[PDB]
């Protein structure tokens, strides 16, 4: 039930502990300690900025409008979620990541402009 | 059709090299600098995690090395500089009841010291160990201190102990330390049982050479760990599963006197010896030691041929700092001869007494530009330590000798079970779910 | 009308100056000043992370789905919001605060998973 | 197309590169390196806090309920948004900025209270 | 230049010129003459745009 306790568990189970890990991201001699504190903050902020860009701000589980091109992983939703741990999944699809992130950004840009045009 | 879902707080990590900070539990040494620890912080079992560990490529070792050396140097900054004392010393033999083993080991020297006033000098008569002085320019009685032809000597502050107070290493937020709990783990490769911790256990920063003192013991059996076992250029770290007790002494009742050499600057020196003059020494139980080596041999035979011969021998060379067992015993620095421990061949309430030398002017780290003078200690010194591991090097018949000159090996023997990783909480997966 | 000006006023009045206080949370010799700046940031981020966990991101007034078990405070609205100042309230229900925060976290986790299965 | 590439283009074009600039806002000898990193964070957080105050958290484009008083600028929608760059616009309405920010803050406070009452 | 050194203190070395091998001559720098004259001519042409022509 503690931090990373679910690391060896299946994705379909581990997804229920997202708040456990989220809360462990924040908190001359003494300078290296300041450097460590500053980078912990900078890494945190980059993840939050990215969620903001994608339109996932404020939530731990974010559904999007980008579809899963099978060429990323042609495995099925009883294998990805019941037979694989997040560590194994991350390795499987680590190559095709800066494609997915790019697509998520593009999708959100279109959603913002379409939403302004409706509110008119 | 499956659509991309973004998850944040995902239990994923990657190998990482980051800055660790120190912490401690609750006469100042290796403290103030570290944050007080949390009681029983946490340990999470991570039941189904298998992970790869690789000691020797572990940067936690380099950080511990840097912190110890830096804190060591910091502690000498406010202490008295013994540069006014780089003079001609006139030295003669010691007029006491000296055993044969100590002949030539001590000298009674007389020097002119500086005083509180710039225009005045005094005449001080002190005992020195032979190892701290050097004769000069073809003059029978004229000596100088060993390190006045290199670095300035700094006297260590008399109020500062060198007690190896344990230091804990803690991860910054966003990072975690993984701990290998496999009792058979040899320092590398997959570890089937890996838990997560906040901060490592405290490790005592004990500084020694060929015999590792007061460390962790193996849980079940002697473990031999080496970067490449068939490469004779590598050191072998042998962890014992049982301690071997070693009793060390400096059996001479010393009188320590002090003078001012400057404006509030005190110098400490051995004034005189009460009673007989004897050699410092260490006692190792003979039977315990022979059992210990037999276990080491049985394990060496799993890497070397089985129907083989294993030989133990004394170091073939190098200076006193690496050919002996160096350690701090009650504030004094001992250099003990271990040839009595490693003189046997193993083929397919008695004790061993190790004679010891004492030095007051030491270098600690393998550096050129620093020296330090350890004030002598009043009375008689005794200490008892646990031998928890050996550092061996290797030349049919495989011959092994004591090594350990490189301090990072001592720290590897405690940090081998820890790995630093970075948490990577953001990731994606297909789910049947679209905005 | 300035910072903490409403501290002595009733909760029902003080609730209208939330932006006044929110704006005062952000901004060897010189090191302790740098340390102070870093910790001010860390405290700010922890509060924001917590609001995000509860589903209150981006807002000063957040209604939730957790009910008020009377055992924490059995006073009526026209006491809590007309008489007591926030300082007196904070003392009254200081003890039972980690319990409320835990409930808010669980409530949001249930809500995020229910929504995922309504967009299916 | 890179950082500030659109600076010389018209507002109506530049508005499509908002993510390009947003992504470039984050990341004794050497102490100044930490000072620089800390201030970058502080400036970032102030912008995010302000968007939160106005109810624009999580978005790069945010429509509001505050109307454009002609006194700020009487230029018609196709002299601003396809004849004028963002640099020239900022100069045109520099004096009248703090007014707008104050109005946006008031608008959001009115919006948060009204919503709360509707969820009773 | 033949360089010698002495110790002046505990690990403190001082370096100095011991002596000179060969003749003692003055240090100097060489600037090509025509190149320098062309360089100034260009500078002068530009100065004349701020000063009278
Ligand atoms: C391996 O671990 C053992 C066990 O911890 C360790 O032995 C210990 O060494 C310390 C330091 O020499 C001993 O502490 C002293 O004990 C004597 C008892 O007579 C006291 O008088 C001493 O106090 C005086 O000196 C202090 C110096 O710092 C002053 O601060 C103080 O005010 C007094 O003037 C001091 O308490 C300790 O007793 C032993 N422990 C045992 C069980 O013998 C050993 O040194 C470690 N080995 C290595 C290599 O680190
Ligand atoms: C090393 O040399 C020094 C200097 O010679 C020796 O110290 C001296 O030792 C003698 C004999 O113990 C001292 O004489 C005694 O003086 C006291 C009064 O101080 C007196 O009560 C005794 O009856 C005796 O006369 C002498 O003072 C002392 N000098 C100093 C500076 O302390 C030292 O003992 C020698 N060490 C050895 C063992 O070689
Ligand atoms: C789905 O992917 C296929 C194959 O794309 C390749 O693998 C991807 C992971 C990525 O690395 C692509 O850049 C690779 O080309 C796509 O088919 C190709 O698409 C690209 C444009 O992205 C095009 O230039 C190629 O000609 C296409 N042909 C192949 C087989 O290489 C397919 O278009 C992708 N579908 C989606 C939803 O974008
Ligand atoms: C409402 O609270 C009661 C009792 O409240 C407990 O003590 C209060 C002062 C405060 O600390 C509450 O948070 C505590 O829960 C609950 O009744 C008890 O509930 C606990 C589990 O929470 C259970 O173990 C006990 O057996 C229950 N019995 C007692 C001693 O009253 C009640 O369940 C809470 N109801 C709601 C709606 O949450
Ligand atoms: C729209 O602006 C006019 C002009 O206001 C001036 O310029 C503004 C940018 C701002 O700086 C104002 O403070 C300036 O007075 C406003 O007309 C005046 O508004 C002020 C303040 O309300 C009032 O005292 C004057 O009597 C008004 N004069 C007139 C000619 O009516 C007008 O109120 C603004 N409208 C809105 C929507 O706020
Ligand atoms: C280390 O071992 C030696 C040898 O056993 C010990 O020396 C004996 O000490 C007792 C007590 O003072 C004497 O009665 C014996 O005569 C000594 N033996 C010899 C051969 O001289 C020594 O005490 C032990 N000590 C340590 C490490 O302090
Ligand atoms: C430890 O003591 C032994 C003696 O038992 C020393 O070994 C001798 O070393 C000399 C060279 O200096 C050789 O000529 C002798 O043959 C060696 N003797 C034996 C029995 O092998 C050893 O050098 C000492 N080591 C240290 C570090 O002091
Ligand atoms: C998911 O896949 C299960 C196994 O299918 C077979 O093995 C995998 C590794 C692939 O090679 C696949 O093409 C093979 O057919 C099936 O038993 C299960 O029913 C599948 N579920 C869904 C929803 O498709
Ligand atoms: C609110 O309560 C005031 C005090 O009366 C009582 O004590 C409090 C703690 C509550 O338990 C309440 O239910 C009790 O009646 C009353 O004077 C006042 O009339 C009450 N007002 C309302 C709107 O109920
Ligand atoms: C917009 O107006 C143009 C003329 O601009 C006039 O002066 C500027 C400074 C503003 O005050 C503006 O409101 C004035 O009307 C016309 O040339 C242009 O055709 C107009 N365009 C539209 C879309 O009506
Ligand atoms: C570990 O795997 C076993 C199946 O081999 C499974 O029953 C168990 O629940 C898993 N443990 C965790 C923590 O997921
Ligand atoms: C995946 O399913 C197979 C089925 O044979 C099982 O043996 C394996 O342990 C499962 N792995 C996990 C991570 O649950
Ligand atoms: C990613 O690319 C590397 C290229 O060296 C390759 O070795 C690895 O297997 C790839 N992983 C996949 C298929 O995602
Ligand atoms: C010193 O040794 C001699 C024998 O050489 C002995 O007669 C004398 O008593 C001893 N002195 C002391 C103080 O033990
Ligand atoms: C003094 O010690 C030296 C060895 O360093 C020895 O040769 C000499 O004979 C000794 N002199 C006396 C008087 O003991
Ligand atoms: C100091 O003198 C000794 C004499 O044995 C010599 O070996 C050493 O190299 C000298 N050190 C320096 C720094 O000159
Ligand atoms: C030596 O080992 C014994 C084993 O019983 C232990 O109690 C003792 O504390 C150890 N000593 C040191 C200094 O670690
Ligand atoms: C350590 O274990 C690994 C397991 O893969 C083995 O290959 C290696 O030879 C072992 N080394 C030693 C010194 O035991
Ligand atoms: C170990 O040493 C041998 C020496 O012959 C060398 O050939 C081999 O590549 C080394 N292996 C590793 C892992 O360093
Ligand atoms: C060390 O001293 C203790 C008494 O404190 C004794 O029981 C033990 O046998 C001695 N150890 C050795 C190796 O002599
Ligand atoms: C090595 O010898 C031991 C007995 O001491 C035996 O159990 C083991 O099987 C032998 N190993 C090999 C490879 O013969
Ligand atoms: C090794 O043991 C033999 C036993 O006969 C002894 O003669 C020899 O001197 C010893 N060597 C060392 C270095 O102690
Ligand atoms: C050293 O000698 C003095 C003589 O006054 C005595 O009081 C002290 O106890 C002795 N110390 C030791 C360790 O023998
Ligand atoms: C302070 O209390 C009085 C009633 O005694 C009330 O009229 C006044 O408005 C209150 N002031 C504030 C800031 O709440
Ligand atoms: C508020 O306080 C006043 C004075 O104690 C009291 O008269 C009034 O009834 C209280 N109002 C309520 C119901 O909270
Ligand atoms: C809060 O806890 C403290 C310590 O247990 C207790 O003294 C106090 O009465 C409690 N207050 C409330 C509001 O229950
Ligand atoms: C610069 O102006 C020209 C002419 O209107 C236009 O075609 C070009 O796209 C403009 N450059 C940018 C970066 O907008
Ligand atoms: C720019 O503004 C001028 C003046 O109103 C106008 O004549 C021109 O048509 C405008 N151009 C565009 C592209 O809006
Ligand atoms: C803003 O005010 C200053 C000072 O009155 C004035 O010089 C400037 O022109 C004004 N600018 C605008 C945008 O009106
Ligand atoms: C500098 O030396 C080089 C040698 O190759 C020569 O060609 C050049 O002309 C010299 N420069 C001057 C200014 O004399
Ligand atoms: C420099 O340029 C002037 C131009 O008037 C010319 O008269 C003179 O001879 C030139 N000198 C050299 C060295 O070329
Ligand atoms: C200076 O003289 C040059 C060369 O005749 C001519 O081109 C230039 O225009 C003149 N400038 C002025 C300011 O007279």
TrEMBL record, chains A, C, D:
Glycans are attached at residues 69, 76, 83, 95. It is a single-pass type I membrane protein. The chain crosses the membrane at residues 1-16. Signal peptide: none annotated. It is found in: Virion membrane; Host cell membrane; Host endosome membrane. Residues 32-50 are annotated as: Immunosuppression. Residues 91-120 form a coiled coil. Disulfide bonds join 56-62. Residues 1-13 are annotated as: Fusion peptide. This is Transmembrane protein gp41. The gene is env. The chain holds residues 517 to 659 of 860 of the full protein.
């Amino acid at each position: 039930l503690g931090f990373l306790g679910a690391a060896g568990s299946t994705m379909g189970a581990a997804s229920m502990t997202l708040t456990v890990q989220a809360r462990n991201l924040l908190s001359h001699w003494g300078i290296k300690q300041l450097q460590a504190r500053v980078l912990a903050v900078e890494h945190y902020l980059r993840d939050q900025q990215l969620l903001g860009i994608w339109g996932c701000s404020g939530k731990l589980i974010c559904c999007t409008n980008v579809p899963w091109n099978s060429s990323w992983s042609n495995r099925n939703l009883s294998e990805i979620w019941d037979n694989m741990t997040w560590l194994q999944w991350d390795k499987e699809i680590s190559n095709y990541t800066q494609i997915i992130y790019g697509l998520l950004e593009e999708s959100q840009n279109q959603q913002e402009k379409n939403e302004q045009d409706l509110l008119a | 059709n499956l659509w991309v879902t973004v998850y944040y707080g995902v239990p994923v990590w990657k190998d990482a090299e980051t800055t660790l900070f120190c912490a401690s539990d609750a006469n100042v040494w290796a403290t103030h600098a570290c944050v007080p620890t949390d009681p029983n912080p946490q340990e999470i079992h991570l039941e189904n995690v298998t992970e790869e560990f690789n000691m020797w490529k572990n940067n936690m070792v380099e950080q511990m090395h840097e912190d110890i050396i830096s804190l060591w140097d910091q502690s000498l900054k406010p202490c008295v500089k013994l540069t006014p004392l780089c003079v001609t010393l006139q030295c003669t033999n010691v007029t006491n009841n000296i055993t044969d083993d100590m002949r030539g080991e001590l000298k009674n020297c007389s020097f002119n010291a500086t005083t509180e006033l710039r225009n005045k000098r005094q005449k001080v008569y002190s005992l020195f160990y032979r190892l701290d002085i050097v004769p000069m320019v073809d003059l029978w009685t004229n000596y100088r201190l060993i390190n006045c032809n290199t670095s300035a000597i700094t006297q260590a502050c008399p109020k500062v102990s060198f007690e190896p107070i344990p230091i804990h290493y803690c991860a910054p937020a966003g990072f975690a330390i993984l701990k290998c709990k496999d009792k058979k783990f040899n320092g590398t490769g997959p570890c089937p049982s890996v838990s997560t911790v906040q901060c490592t256990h405290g490790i005592k920063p004990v500084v020694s050479t060929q015999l590792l003192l007061n460390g962790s013991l193996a849980e079940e059996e002697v473990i031999i760990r080496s970067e490449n076992i068939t490469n004779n250029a590598k050191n072998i770290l042998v962890q014992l599963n049982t301690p071997v007790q070693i009793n060390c002494t400096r059996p001479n009742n010393n009188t320590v006197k002090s003078i001012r050499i400057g404006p509030g600057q005190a110098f400490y020196y051995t004034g005189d010896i009460i009673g007989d003059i004897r050699q410092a020494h260490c006692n190792v139980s003979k039977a315990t030691w022979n059992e210990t080596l037999g276990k080491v041999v049985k394990q060496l035979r799993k890497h070397f041929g089985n129907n083989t011969i294993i030989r133990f021998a004394q170091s073939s060379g190098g200076d006193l700092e690496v050919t002996t067992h160096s350690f701090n015993c009650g504030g004094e620095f001992f250099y003990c001869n271990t040839s009595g421990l490693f003189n046997s061949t193993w083929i397919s309430n008695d004790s061993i007494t190790l004679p010891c030398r004492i030095k007051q002017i030491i270098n600690m780290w393998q550096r050129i530009g620093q020296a330090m003078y350890a004030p002598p200690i009043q009375g008689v010194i005794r200490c008892v330590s646990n031998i928890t591991g050996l550092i061996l090097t290797r030349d049919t018949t495989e011959t092994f000798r004591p090594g350990g000159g490189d301090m990072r090996d001592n720290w590897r023997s405690e940090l081998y079970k820890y790995k630093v990783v970075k948490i990577e909480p953001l990731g994606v997966a297909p789910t049947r779910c679209k905005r």
